[PDB]
């Protein structure tokens, strides 16, 4: 149905240990498809999914040049940020960027993004209107004024409304076997007695893609949101994800509890119980 493309930049200084490292990774949904690393022996954009490999040589050389130019630009950006924040040249700092587009089932732009961070804090971001900026502080206001003057937002908008959506459409078609295949969770409930009169019921979802999922326990049809232990969704290593949710229940009262699983690879909306 709905899909995303994002590129993620990290530029990290390391005084005493060479020049700042610049990395780019590109994703479609929860699938990594391209990477660049300035520390590579031969730095270039590399394919990381089968369906991107059929892009021609011109693609790969254009893409690689963008990132090689960005390695130099972001080194300059890091130097500039030291000045803006009155920081010494002895510390390690990080600029991050994430940008891209979300598209709906018809392949039309839902929304565009272009967000930056400095040292893990918001710095400047393109607003949803694709025409104005939000700066987090007076240093980022200096960048905003520069980018307003150069009409950067207009160029962003053109990319996000054009090339971003057009290339994502193409990737989704070339990768349709995987990118447009939702893998439902394989789901079970396990039983772990804590003590004589309480047990843990753990509801498991394994092998699913994309990562988005809902796992909830109900007691007598009532959500147990305050009392559910929920782990972060984690990658299995095979493109798929795992998650679990656990409740501690009084022994004997196990069948009062149901696990509810929503995932775009389902149907329905699954309901699970402990099965002795």
């Amino acid at each position: 149905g709905s899909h995303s493309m994002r590129y993620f930049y990290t530029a990290m200084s390391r005084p005493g240990r060479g020049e700042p490292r610049f990395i780019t990774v590109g994703y479609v949904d929860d699938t990594l498809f391209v990477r660049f690393d300035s520390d590579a022996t031969s730095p270039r954009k590399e394919p990381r999914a089968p369906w991107i490999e059929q892009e021609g040589p011109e693609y790969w050389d254009r893409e690689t040049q963008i990132s090689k130019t960005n390695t130099q630009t972001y080194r300059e950006n890091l130097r500039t940020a030291l000045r803006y924040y009155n920081q010494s040249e002895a510390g390690s700092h990080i600029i991050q960027r994430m940008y891209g587009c979300d598209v709906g089932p018809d392949g039309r732009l839902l929304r565009g993004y272009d967000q930056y961070a400095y040292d893990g804090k918001d710095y400047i971001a393109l607003n949803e209107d694709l025409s104005s900026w939000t700066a987090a502080d007076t240093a980022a206001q200096i960048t905003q004024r520069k980018w307003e003057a150069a009409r950067v937002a207009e160029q962003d908008r053109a990319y996000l409304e054009g090339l971003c959506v057009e290339s994502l459409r193409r990737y989704l078609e070339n990768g349709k076997e995987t990118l447009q295949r939702a893998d439902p969770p394989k789901t079970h409930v396990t039983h772990h007695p804590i003590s004589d009169h309480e047990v843990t019921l753990r509801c498991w979802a394994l092998g699913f893609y994309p990562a988005e999922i809902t796992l909830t326990w109900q007691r007598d049809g009532e959500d147990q949101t305050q009392d559910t232990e929920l782990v972060e969704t984690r990658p299995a290593g095979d493109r798929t994800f795992q998650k679990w949710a656990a409740v501690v229940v009084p022994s004997g009262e196990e069948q009062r509890y149901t696990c509810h699983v929503q995932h775009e690879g389902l149907p329905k909306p699954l309901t699970l119980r402990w099965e002795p």
């Binding site: 963008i66 990132s67 300059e76 950006n77 200096i142 520069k146 980018w147 150069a150 160029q155 990319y159």
Partner: peptide, 10 residues
């Protein structure tokens, strides 16, 4: 495909 944003710097 990436955006080649011209002269964009902090």
């Amino acid at each position: 495909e990436e955006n080649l944003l011209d002269f964009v710097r902090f």
